[PDB]
Ligand binder design. Structure first.
Ligand code: ADP
Length: 442
């Protein structure tokens, strides 16, 4: 039924596999180790043939030119196939996307869509009420959300499963109409999925496969609330019933606590460094009285040069303004993220920060919550937050895979509380620790 592939189509098969020509770095990954922790963990696999992937998957794997499974894909696939929860850490290019889509799809085709859906299509309840995805993949940004989606279209070619993606900063009405056309594997970004839900367009009652792609990156952009609203606060099946998978390069305490509540008797999969923060990111904490702050920032900027971008965080919108004011006044090409405005207009203001025009960007925690501010070499904490949690996804905005970024933070009496946590964080990340910091912790 859901296992026996439907008749092909050239026009469609052409659209989905436009040559591709893109293959993963298949030689500099086999050099990286893959540790798998957990009880009675299902033994990894060598070839996609080491487990019944079903007709359709095996078929589509060919049309996408995949010979054998990447490293992570060697341990991930059999883990998901034997229906075990998973927390996986691996750097981009590892082949994470295919690692969760394949086994998941292979399962739907195998097990079918569930009796709820089955006995709901054959029920004269025709129309466009509410769609219930069988699998949900939460993603941090529209860029990645769509890549995943594209990937799903390929692997779900010639099956009863219609993939569908939604995200913010687009006409919701259009996306809503797209949902109405079919949902089985919905890929979405936290905020939008919640919006769709409130609008009664999506239901999570029959979601059996939950995947949080780049959980750490999602939290950075301040999504935790929705993620929990989505998972814990709704019609979604509890753990043990639904199968969950988390994917994230870094493994901070806020992700450990997330993997804790969401995953169930899960296997930890790490293919490299167990980073508490991004491996490639430098942290310099310096003591600066409030008065000396602006001048200190200025010296910091003159040095900046580098034809790089600088993201400057402050604590209040009030000061984000007076500082943005101060910086324009001193003759600096800087802009400011508007909190109030929609994230559609906000993703616009960044279009000019990006092209050099204004290498300086001053924003508060809130104001950027939701935005994908990438391409930033220097993140400076003009003010520090109350929690070391915030600190983490604040310095997160920099050091994106490939090149190293810098995160300078001004620290003074005003935040002696977050002392001990900041110290530990630096010890862990093996950063330089100011003697005065150690002293002010007892
Ligand atoms: N097992 C594989 N064999 C050959 N190519 C693969 C395999 N897995 C992924 N790829 C290729 O790598 C690309 C995906 O890389 P990707 O999975 O998106 O890295 P990441 O998981 O960090 O985002 C795809 O376009 C695909 O063609």
């Amino acid at each position: 039924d859901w296992s026996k592939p439907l008749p092909p189509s050239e026009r469609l098969e052409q659209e989905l596999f436009s040559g591709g020509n893109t293959g993963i770095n298949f030689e500099k990954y086999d050099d990286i180790p893959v540790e798998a922790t957990g009880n009675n963990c299902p033994p990894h696999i060598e070839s996609f043939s080491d487990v019944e992937m079903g007709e359709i998957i095996m078929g589509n794997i060919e049309l996408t030119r995949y010979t054998r499974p990447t490293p992570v894909q060697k341990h991930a696939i059999p883990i998901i196939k034997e229906k075990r929860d998973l927390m996986a850490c691996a750097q981009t290019g590892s082949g994470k996307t295919a690692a969760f889509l394949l086994p998941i799809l292979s399962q739907i085709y195998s097990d079918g869509p569930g009796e709820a859906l089955r006995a709901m299509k054959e029920n004269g309840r025709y129309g466009r009420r509410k769609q219930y995805p069988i699998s949900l993949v939460l993603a941090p940004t529209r860029e990645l959300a769509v890549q995943i989606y594209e990937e799903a279209r390929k692997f779900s070619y010639r099956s009863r499963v219609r993939p569908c993606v939604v995200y913010g900063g687009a006409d919701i009405g259009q996306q809503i109409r797209d949902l109405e056309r079919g949902c089985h594997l919905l890929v979405a970004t936290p905020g939008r999925l919640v919006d769709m839900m409130e609008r009664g367009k999506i239901g999570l009652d029959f979601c059996k496969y939950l995947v949080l792609d780049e959980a750490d990156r999602m939290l950075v952009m301040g999504f935790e609330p929705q993620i929990r609203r989505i998972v814990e606060q709704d019609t979604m099946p509890p753990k043990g019933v639904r199968h969950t998978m988390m994917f994230s390069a870094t493994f901070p305490k806020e992700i450990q606590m997330l993997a804790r509540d969401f995953l169930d008797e899960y296997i930890f999969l790490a293919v490299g460094r167990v980073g508490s923060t991004s491996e490639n990111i430098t942290q310099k904490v310096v003591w600066v009285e409030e008065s000396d702050k602006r001048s200190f920032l200025l010296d910091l900027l003159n040095a900046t040069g580098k034809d790089s971008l600088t993201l400057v965080f402050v604590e209040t919108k009030k000061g984000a303004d007076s500082l943005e004011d101060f910086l324009y006044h001193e003759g600096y090409a800087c802009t400011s993220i508007h909190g109030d405005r929609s994230q559609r207009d906000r993703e616009e203001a960044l279009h000019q920060f990006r092209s050099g025009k204004s290498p300086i960007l001053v924003a508060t925690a809130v104001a950027a919550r939701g935005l994908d501010i990438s391409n930033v070499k220097h993140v400076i904490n003009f003010d520090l937050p109350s929690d070391i949690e915030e600190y983490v996804h604040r310095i997160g905005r920099t050091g994106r895979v490939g090149n190293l970024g810098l995160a300078t933070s001004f620290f003074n009496e005003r935040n002696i509380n977050i002392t001990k946590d900041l110290l530990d964080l630096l010890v862990e990340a093996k950063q330089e620790v100011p003697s005065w910091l150690e002293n002010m912790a007892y």
